[PDB]
């Protein structure tokens, strides 16, 4: 996601933490964000451009084979030079395992728990963005130029940001905090309140990232790439039909992030 999807995913997650998770998250954050995880959940998108964090660039996404519409960890979760685990599913495992040493303490200089928290929180968002688990040759739709209503865009960006920005504008006066409340509403009492226990039961961490990534490639095929031709204009049709899919993935990432953090920081 771009900034808004991450902010919403992290705020949903922060509001669902248990007491030990809430406290750990508070101890790990810098004072300037006043306890707000969502104010830093974009940080991995900032530092992926830094020379010292070049290793992080492949960790935001998964390249799956063109037109195959499936994910397999061994085949797909590796960077462009074949180094294993270097994808968003591998990263979620890595930082979850790192945070599980926080309770007992670590005598390793190099494990930074603030960064583990921010990477984990961000990547839990990314694995839920369907076009972050799209085809290899089009870079998850980044190479598919198009137009979104009047202005120029690309298919990846439509899912990272445009659908969210158009929904916020048309129904919430550009107000993301209120959009987020309706998402929160839709799983506390609304249409997703039925599915909640389901979202939370995905096995161990490998099992959950496999599940999340599979859901994402399947949405990328069924809803993302579906109907789209390069150079053309997408508008009310694509926007109205895809919006609810985008909203659910925001919600799902948040809910599942909270579950992970509750497990790693809890008993």
Ligand X SMILES: *[C@@H]1O[C@H](CO)[C@@H](O[C@@H]2O[C@H](CO)[C@@H](O[C@@H]3O[C@H](CO)[C@@H](O)[C@H](O)[C@@H]3O)[C@H](O)[C@H]2NC(C)=O)[C@H](O)[C@H]1NC(C)=O
Ligand Y SMILES: *[C@@H]1O[C@H](CO)[C@@H](O[C@@H]2O[C@H](CO)[C@@H](O[C@@H]3O[C@H](CO[C@H]4O[C@H](CO)[C@@H](O)[C@H](O)[C@@H]4O)[C@@H](O)[C@H](O)[C@@H]3O)[C@H](O)[C@H]2NC(C)=O)[C@H](O)[C@H]1NC(C)=O
Binding-site ranges for ligand Y (CB under 6 A):
30, 32, 40, 43, 112, 114-115
The option from Zn ion, ligand Y, ligand X, none interacting with 40 (CB < 5 to 8 A, set by class) reads: ligand Y
- Closer Cβ to ligand Y, 43 or 172, answer by number: 43
Binding segment for ligand X (CB under 6 A), chosen from 19-27, 90-98, 142-150, 194-202, is 90-98
Q: How many chain residues are in contact with ligand X, going by CB under 6 A?
A: 18
Taking the CA atoms of residue 197, residue 203, residue 204 and residue 208 in that order, the dihedral angle to the nearest 10 degrees is -80
The one among 72, 182, 201, 232 contacting ligand X by CB under 6 A: 182
The option from Zn ion, ligand Y, ligand X, none interacting with 176 (CB < 5 to 8 A, set by class) reads: none
The option from Zn ion, ligand X, ligand Y, none interacting with 114 (CB < 5 to 8 A, set by class) reads: ligand Y
- Closer Cβ to ligand Y, 40 or 259, answer by number: 40
Does 168 help bind ligand X (rule: CB under 6 A)? no
Binding segment for Zn ion (CB under 5 A), chosen from 74-82, 125-133, 193-201, 241-249, is 125-133
Minimum distance from residue 30 beta carbon to ligand Y (Å)? 4
- Contact assessment for residue 220 and residue 133, using Cβ atoms and an 8 Å cutoff: yes
- Contact assessment for residue 141 and residue 61, using Cβ atoms and an 8 Å cutoff: no
From residue 220 to residue 259, the character string flagging contacts with ligand X as x (rule: CB under 6 A) and all else as - is --------------------x------x------------
Does 176 help bind ligand X (rule: CB under 6 A)? no
The option from ligand X, Zn ion, ligand Y, none interacting with 43 (CB < 5 to 8 A, set by class) reads: ligand Y
Which residues 22-51 are close enough to bind Zn ion by CB under 5 A? 45
**String of DSSP letters for 1-61:** --HHHHHHHHHHHHTT--HHHHHHHHHHS-GGGTT-GGGTTTHHHHHTTSGGGGGGGGGG-
End-to-end CA distance of the chain: 31
What's the rounded Cα separation, in Å, for the pair 132 and 190?
A: 27
81 annotated as ligand-binding: no
- Binding-site positions read 1, 6, 45, 60, 108, 122, 126, 132, 156, 160
- Binding-site positions for Zn(2+) read 1, 6, 45, 60, 108, 122, 126, 132, 156, 160
Residues that bind ligand X (CB under 6 A): 55, 59, 85-86, 90-91, 94, 110-111, 171, 179, 182-183, 186, 190-191, 240, 247
């Amino acid at each position: 996601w771009s900034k808004e999807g991450h902010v919403m995913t992290c705020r949903i997650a922060q509001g669902l933490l248990n007491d030990e998770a809430a406290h750990a998250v508070k101890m790990l954050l810098p004072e300037y964000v006043n306890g707000d995880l969502s104010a830093l959940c974009v940080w991995p998108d900032q530092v992926r451009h830094w020379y010292k964090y070049k290793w992080t660039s492949p960790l935001h996404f998964i390249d799956t084979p063109d037109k195959a519409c499936n994910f397999d960890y061994e085949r797909d979760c590796h960077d462009q030079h074949g180094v294993k685990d270097m994808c968003v599913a591998g990263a979620i495992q890595n930082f979850t395992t790192q945070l599980s040493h926080y309770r007992e303490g670590t005598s390793d200089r190099r494990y930074n728990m603030t960064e583990a928290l921010l990477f984990l929180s961000h990547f839990m968002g990314d694995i839920h963005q369907p076009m972050h688990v799209g085809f290899t040759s089009d870079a998850g739709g980044n190479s598919i130029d198009l137009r979104w209503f009047r202005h120029k865009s690309n298919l990846h960006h439509v899912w990272d940001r445009e659908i969210i920005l158009t929904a916020a504008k048309d129904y919430y006066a550009k107000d993301i905090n209120l959009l987020e409340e309706d998402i929160e509403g839709n799983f506390t009492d609304g249409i997703w309140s039925d599915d909640l226990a389901s979202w939370r039961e995905c096995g161990n961490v490998f099992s959950c990232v496999n599940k999340f990534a599979t859901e994402s490639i399947n949405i990328a095929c069924k809803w993302g790439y579906k109907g789209v031709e390069a150079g053309e204009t997408l508008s009310d049709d694509y926007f109205n039909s895809r919006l609810p899919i985008v909203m659910k993935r925001v919600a799902q990432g948040g809910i599942r992030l909270a579950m992970l953090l509750n497990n790693v920081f809890g008993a």
